[PDB]
Design a protein around this ligand. Structure first.
Ligand SMILES: O/N=C1\NC[C@@H](O[C@@H]2OC[C@@H](O)[C@H](O)[C@H]2O)[C@H](O)[C@H]1O
Length: 312
């Protein structure tokens, strides 16, 4: 294979990236997006703040751009994310009780309906759990509606889009731990009670030299519950600046992650949260950390590239 697109295509899996539609006007960015991936997800364009800035007022221009890019280039389209405690407009946070539930339900219905037939899978609910186990403690959805909001969102999504693969997404759940266990229980419960749920997304925002040794094992147990699994926001951050041994360790980590997916029949593929370190979200969120993607700031392939190629 000459591109990661071919490598993934050959493995019968997806290799995607998080797209910022505005960067499509940047030649080198587009060249890589066009040639190295077979799947695309909106890094921000389809979130609540970007789609419903004011209650009942939707703005799909940005999300449409991402969707159009996918159809135009023949790539699968993944949707991120319908219900999430972050990047939630104040107007929504200002609602309570029935008013809030109705706003959530309508947001799911409107967005899912708008992209119906285009988005193949949705991160319906994102980051519902807490590190250490249990439900997230700073979520407007958890605080205003309690435990049942997740099921409500999934049922609402399925009603709006009868065929889309509906996933629940989270981070720090790549290995077996208290958090992934809480997620495992939810997934099992939903399948047992017939709640619409087809997949689980393992964000995989990892630290280099720290890939869980039980990654595949964890992916397999979720797959065994009767759902598909997918690595949705892969990036492995290191302490900056980068150097040779850090880049090599990172390359090794990327190989380990793609391998775990390859070892699970139901792992749909791997999506990296961005193309180049030039735009990666890590530095501004994790002080002193970065250089987490496959391409550096000059659009030069890093060692991680060959590792991903070999893994597929
Ligand atoms: O870990 N969980 C997530 N991580 C990255 C999130 O995407 C970021 O959201 C904030 C924006 O300012 C950034 O541009 C964007 O990369 C993702 O939505 C979430 O699931």
């Amino acid at each position: 294979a000459t591109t990661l697109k071919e490598a993934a295509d050959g493995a019968g899996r997806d290799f995607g990236f998080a797209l910022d539609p505005n960067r499509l006007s940047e030649a080198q960015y587009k060249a890589i997006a066009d040639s190295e991936f077979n799947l695309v997800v909106a890094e921000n364009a389809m979130k609540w703040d970007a789609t419903e800035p004011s209650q009942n007022s939707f703005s799909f221009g940005a999300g449409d751009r991402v969707a159009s890019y996918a159809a135009d280039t023949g790539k699968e389209l993944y949707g991120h994310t319908l219900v999430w405690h972050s990047q939630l407009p104040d107007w929504a946070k200002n609602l309570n009780g029935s008013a809030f539930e109705s706003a959530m339900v309508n947001h799911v219905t409107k967005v899912a309906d708008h992209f119906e037939g285009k988005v193949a899978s949705w991160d319906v609910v994102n980051e519902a759990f807490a590190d250490g186990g249990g439900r997230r403690q700073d979520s407007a959805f958890q605080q205003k509606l309690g435990n049942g909001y997740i099921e409500t969102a999934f049922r609402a999504a399925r009603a709006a889009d009868p065929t889309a693969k509906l996933c629940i997404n989270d981070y720090n759940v790549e290995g077996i731990n208290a958090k992934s266990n809480s997620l495992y229980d939810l997934v099992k419960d939903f399948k047992a009670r017939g709640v619409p749920l087809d997949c689980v997304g393992f964000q995989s925002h990892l630290i280099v030299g720290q890939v869980p040794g039980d990654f595949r094992q964890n992916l397999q147990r979720f797959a065994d519950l009767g759902v598909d699994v997918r690595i949705t926001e892969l990036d492995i951050r290191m302490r900056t600046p980068s150097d040779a041994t850090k880049l090599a360790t990172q390359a090794a980590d990327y190989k380990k992650v793609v391998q775990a997916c390859m070892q699970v029949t139901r792992c749909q593929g791997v999506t990296v949260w961005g193309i180049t370190d030039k735009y990666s979200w890590v530095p501004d969120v994790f002080p002193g950390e970065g250089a987490a993607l496959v391409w550096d700031a000059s659009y030069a392939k890093k060692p991680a590239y060959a590792a991903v190629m070999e893994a597929f």
